[PDB]
Design a protein around this ligand. Sequence first.
Ligand SMILES: Nc1ncnc2c1ncn2[C@@H]1O[C@H](COP(=O)(O)OP(=O)(O)O)[C@@H](O)[C@H]1O
Ligand SMILES: [Mg+2]
Length: 338
Amino acid sequence: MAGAARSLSRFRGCLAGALLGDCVGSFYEVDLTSVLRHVQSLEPTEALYYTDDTAMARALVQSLLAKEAFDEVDMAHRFAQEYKKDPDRGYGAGVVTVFKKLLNPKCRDVFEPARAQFNGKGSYGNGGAMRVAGISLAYSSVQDVQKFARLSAQLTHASSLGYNGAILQALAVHLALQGESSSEHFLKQLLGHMEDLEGDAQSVLDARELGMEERPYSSRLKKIGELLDQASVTREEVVSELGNGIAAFESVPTAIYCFLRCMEPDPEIPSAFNSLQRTLIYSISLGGDTDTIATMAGAIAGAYYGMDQVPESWQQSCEGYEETDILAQSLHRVFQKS
Ligand SMILES: Nc1ncnc2c1ncn2[C@@H]1O[C@H](COP(=O)(O)OP(=O)(O)O)[C@@H](O)[C@H]1O
Ligand SMILES: [Mg+2]
């Protein structure tokens, strides 16, 4: 079991969970039967490549470790150089333009490329959120998590839909690292934070311009509360109400739903699977952007259940699982230990 709030086990389980989500989810980038069939093939060697989700998470974490702090110039450069070195990881069509501009040594304003995206409105993709878990490992306070989730996200994702998705994901990880909670209290804390954020005029403006409801993440969290109280919620219901898409708004709430729903056993998923495995399986069964939804659900679940629920056979199937683990331990030593 995962032990105290912000334990080493929780740190390790968080990054391993994210890696598992990316690697296993990537196979389907779908039905529950087919997923269950496919995961049997993990049972008894870095055979599953990671994608942009992990590549960016690793750069983000390496920046934090390098500076023992957030440094936007260092982080932007690490993202750009990681892309330069290994461009075929499955980066979004939009965000590669950001990396190209950052690679220009004349670029001394590292937030400006992201702001120019999509006719100056910014990306609303889930790429800011997919990599953000490291932020919550580095920072314990809600205040710092919000601040640095936003800043890290804004390096590529300047739309409030994009960066607020990243904050929500980081807040979910923040909470999961604290250990045992009712699903009620977990969801309620998230709702409260997003209601606070969606009172800001930039959030209200971005939402209105995109033709959405007035406080979008808040509305989705309320929907999650309803779904968690509803009988026999089907994949159709989840996907139609929450989404399974590349947009942050259609993937971050979904990931959180998968975590909360899978806190309890489910007779549709064999009992031999543990809670972390169940969460990953369920999230992939939703289809769509299985890679990023599973990566995000995995980060939350990993933080909550800890490393003892990370199956060696799954973990050792993933490219770079040892590097991922070292980074988690390093985050714990530098920012959690003294
Ligand atoms: N403001 C936007 N207008 C139109 N499409 C967008 C917008 N923001 C994101 N997208 C879509 O989402 C995709 C992924 O976003 P992008 O920022 O490239 O990468 P990431 O997957 O890292 O979020 C884009 O290639 C595009 O298809
Ligand atoms: Mg990916």
